[PDB]
Amino acid sequence: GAMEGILDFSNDLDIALLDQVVSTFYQGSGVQQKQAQEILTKFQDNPDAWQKADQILQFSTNPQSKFIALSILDKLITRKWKLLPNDHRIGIRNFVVGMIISMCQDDEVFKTQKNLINKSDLTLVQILKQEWPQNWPEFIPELIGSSSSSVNVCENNMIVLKLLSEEVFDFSAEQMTQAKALHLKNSMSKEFEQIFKLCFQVLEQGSSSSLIVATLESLLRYLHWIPYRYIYETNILELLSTKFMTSPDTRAITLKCLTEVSNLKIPQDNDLIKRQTVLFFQNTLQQIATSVMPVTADLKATYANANGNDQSFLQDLAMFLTTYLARNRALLESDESLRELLLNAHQYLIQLSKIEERELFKTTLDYWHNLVADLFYEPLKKHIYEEICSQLRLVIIENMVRPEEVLVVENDEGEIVREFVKESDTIQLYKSEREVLVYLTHLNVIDTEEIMISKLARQIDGSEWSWHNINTLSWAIGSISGTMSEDTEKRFVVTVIKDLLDLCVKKRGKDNAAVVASDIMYVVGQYPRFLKAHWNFLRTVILKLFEFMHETHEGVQDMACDTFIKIVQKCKYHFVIQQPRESEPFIQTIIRDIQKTTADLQPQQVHTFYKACGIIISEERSVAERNRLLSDLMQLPNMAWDTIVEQSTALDSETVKIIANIIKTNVAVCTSMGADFYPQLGHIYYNMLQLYRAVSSMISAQVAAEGLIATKTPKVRGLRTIKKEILKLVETYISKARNLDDVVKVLVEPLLNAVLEDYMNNVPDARDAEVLNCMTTVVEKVGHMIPQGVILILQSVFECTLDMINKDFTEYPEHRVEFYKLLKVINEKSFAAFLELPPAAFKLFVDAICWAFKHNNRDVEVNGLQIALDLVKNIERMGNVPFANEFHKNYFFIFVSETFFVLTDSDHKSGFSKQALLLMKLISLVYDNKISVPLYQEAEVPQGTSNQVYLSQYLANMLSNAFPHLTSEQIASFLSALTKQCKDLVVFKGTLRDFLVQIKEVGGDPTDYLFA
Amino acid sequence: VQFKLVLVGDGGTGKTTFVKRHLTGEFEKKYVATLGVEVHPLVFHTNRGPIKFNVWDTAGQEKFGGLRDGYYIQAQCAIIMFDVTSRVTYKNVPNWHRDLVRVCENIPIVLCGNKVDIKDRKVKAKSIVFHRKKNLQYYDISAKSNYNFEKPFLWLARKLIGDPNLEFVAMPALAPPEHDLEVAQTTALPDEDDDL
Amino acid sequence: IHFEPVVKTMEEDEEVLYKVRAKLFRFDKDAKEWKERGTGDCKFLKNKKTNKVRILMRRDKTLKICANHIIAPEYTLKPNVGSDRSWVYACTADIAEGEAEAFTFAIRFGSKENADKFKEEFEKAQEINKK
């Protein structure tokens, strides 16, 4: 179409057409906008497009066209600058400088084309980064000179200097070599005195202008790095904390400056400086109280109103106060004349903490933690803050977020329902609130109790009754468990429980009942110390939880199950012994009535129940009694099992569900009982493995008869669930087994027989990744005892799994992850298994390792790099033997080059540290002469040539071909540095980072690699 | 009638998936790298009327970056995305922010930590503080589970319209008026293990 | 002396016959795959003037409509090969996205019971719409 004309460089650039294409892109829509976008990207990316830039800047009537021209230049400057003839460098500098001057001198343009001017300033800064000061020594003096001649120019110069400071000090780490960053930082440091002079003069002579704001914006950047004397030995702090706080247009940036000042590197013995630090804070707080709002102001209301920039201001005030006080409050704590200031600042923080804004609350809460942790330890301090802490107790208690355990919530219809999902983003918030409240309770246990008990009184009397209020209170009460003495806790918990019970009587209906029940469950689950001392109470609590397991309210029901196991995890000993005046241990009573108790629960809830019983049973350390308890617990699933094994020996969807649930029940109990589960495993083991085979046959048959789509059917998914749960059971037991001889002698051979050939001989879509996971635990735990078993495992899963995962990075994601975990552990525990592989298979192993570190998936990538490192170590440990010598001849340069590839391709930045570690190991093998044979071919290089010399030659050639824009000297210098630094990982990594910078541009300085 | 929104962040953080979820309801599992930018109108109904975002979903991969900051010109709001399972993506947030605010000096910006559905979270909640000094709103999100998926747009709509009490409301529901079916029946529904 | 005191969904004319949480998919014929359209409450709504029953479904949080169509007597619920808690059916005129458009839908529920209850209610609605 018409628009594509600009892509034809054989003809002159039609600027009118360019402007039309640009307008269509920015202001158009649909297909036309999309077409325009593509054209503009192709235009921008044309390597001669920069030659059109001056023409565009001169003749265009579209500010966006000119922006795009500047982007084209920016790309040239940052990547190919040193490729240009010198006259082209001079020319580009001149027309950028001239354009900036020209735009600043025309008031209308200056006022209305800020985007373009800012883009021009940044482009100038890119040129400075290449040229300054070595080929532009007078830039700063001339900038300073030009500032006096025009307010527009002066203002814009402040933007240039701000951007320069950012690029040199804030963003250089990733974008420049260590040497070049140092050069530019030194260069700015050397001329800062004159920059500051200008800055300060401007600040003295102005009050509220755009110039003043631009100047303060630059100052904010400078404070990241300048020496403190510029801040403390001038009158600048007075100006910042008084004058610039008065005007709202300067207040925002000034407060940010003062926040950074509060972070300057500052002498600690200097009384004078301490005075100045107190004074600026004093000034600032005064200005806030007189110009903005008194300390009594309702900041919650102000924030919620969201007028103008109020939210940002209050955010910034929070940041200022918390930053200053965390560092400096000690300066205000001893002098009685500074007490009012200290408390006023904290009172503003209290007010800020009432604001409804989660992320802001986290910021203030972080400060409160800093404070209360200090008051907990530092002698004679807490009394100073007793009024502040008392108020803070109220704020926290009233703003407690719902604990992860509380599974009921109010919906938009005003109904108390089970939550749809976990509130994952409040887990940390709760922890943080609990932490502060715990400290606050310790600081004054009497105040905290009084606040809570009286708040509770106003719930029952009705005056403050609401779900919100009973909730936050109950959550707070639970959250302080451990802070009181047992005796105080005793009385306190008693009072709380009675009140909650009373509340339940008075507030009827399923919504009220669910809320109060959720709150009682939370509190009782939080106080196991109490439960352990009050058996009658504990027993009755558990029986009530059992009642809730029949609740039609699913939230209450589910919470009862979780509360039951939470209590059992801490109180299990009291269920296993025969309590005074009881006829039997409570576990006996529990097991007997299990069918009734769990009748209304969902299967996963039944499994949780059984898991809790397992915790109790494992308390019995006498073997005969424990085994009998286990047998009793497993009565229902064992009876169901026995009848299904009988019938199977003679598989509809209902039976498959029954089977899955039997095995899941065993997994649950095995999880809590671990080593103690063995006798139950022994009851089902051989028939279970027979069922695995039967199920495997059914799955295979179904796939054969219906096609691969069979694997998506409910029937087949159910059959695979049986296989997966069997594997999980065995994995779970073996991960916890204490008798490894029985594992090897009884469990392993039947397991391998049942699972390995089945995995190998199924089509890819029917193979369970869980087989690999089970095998990883087998190798991890007993691999050292079963060398032939490990070989069998490799033979059955290695090549067939590799073939599933080596066509792309996406297919069979679970197989991919489990496959490399398995290889990792085999390489760690049973290296001999790899030694036994035929050469072609060992080659595939090397291939598989390198394939892993080309993944962007972290699970796989990390394990791949680790396998490689462990492999090298394994080879090295073998010493001077044929296998190791052949390994190096075959694979050393493959590992070196593959590691370089992922280091340098910009698509594997997450792996840098482990990549660098591997490269360093490989290089150090040669420079330590740990490789006995020559790495080179017989006639490739002169005989007797060292591996060191040949390594450098190989690497130089590799890099010369892979990165042809680099000079020979750049490559030589890099390799010299890298090889010398192969015992010093920190320095070695810096040299790699420097190389990664240099390859992105032309003409990088080879002396950069000498950086110390 | 409408607001220009630029969405920026590292490649693979879930920018395009997040927008698609909002446009059509779908969850795209495949990673197809955005090339330069893709523009989509997106409308929400609120108690203060319809609000239209023109969403400029930009490329995060350097090799597909296109006009880069050229896309930010005259943006009225923004979303900066990262992936809580990839620390490098959070590390790069200041870079995206820097490039954005250089062009867009005073706009409301939401920082989003995506993929919180993934069990093995790498960027710890406690670590996420970059937004504080920069006055960005922050949310944990998941385009996959829809965890907080509406929050970024709700916050932005409130800031842009200048009404803290703005809420999404239900659209009016107007009265409503071959063996490609066989293919549909025999193509399995995705994610059969999910709760819904 | 009396002191002077200080100074549309379109669903108002409809009875909720049935409500259930559901996930809705639409079949992309070209790329042969199912795509999610929304998760939320699926309601059967009977117009009190015309006695006509429709499916109206809205997405959680945004409240955007993902299904709006008459429960036609000629529609038939069919199973999906992968699911025991879903139905698939052809719809010739859904107006969720504006203009009337034909779709092959699939709708999945929290359980088989929910799916079965839905089918029963669906067929009840068809009989109502027949009258």
Ligand SMILES: *[C@H](CC(=O)O)[C@H](C)[C@@H](O)/C=C/C(=C\[C@H](C)C/C=C/C(C)=C/[C@@H](C)C(=O)[C@@H](C)[C@H](O)[C@@H](C)C/C(C)=C/C(=O)O)CC
């Ligand atoms: C509704 C109340 C209602 O309608 O009556 C609520 C939601 C209930 O359904 C839920 C109750 C729950 C737990 C209760 C706390 C369990 C009750 C235990 C109880 C009454 C135990 C007796 C044996 C006591 O020990 C009593 C007499 C004693 O006074 C207790 C309350 C205080 C103690 C231990 C005093 C002492 O000196 O030791 C939901 C889990």
Ligand SMILES: Nc1nc2c(ncn2[C@@H]2O[C@H](COP(=O)(O)OP(=O)(O)NP(=O)(O)O)[C@@H](O)[C@H]2O)c(=O)[nH]1
């Ligand atoms: N588990 C999970 N995966 C997600 C989520 N959001 C996106 N993804 C996945 O992440 C991958 C990348 O998504 P995409 O939206 O293309 O990322 P992008 O930020 O647009 N990449 P680019 O900047 O290159 O265009 C996809 O495979 C997608 O399915 C999420 O919330 N959870």
Ligand SMILES: [Cl-]
């Ligand atoms: Cl512009």
Ligand SMILES: [Cl-]
């Ligand atoms: Cl105990």
Ligand SMILES: [Cl-]
């Ligand atoms: Cl050279």
Ligand SMILES: [Mg+2]
């Ligand atoms: Mg049979």
Ligand SMILES: [Mg+2]
């Ligand atoms: Mg994308």
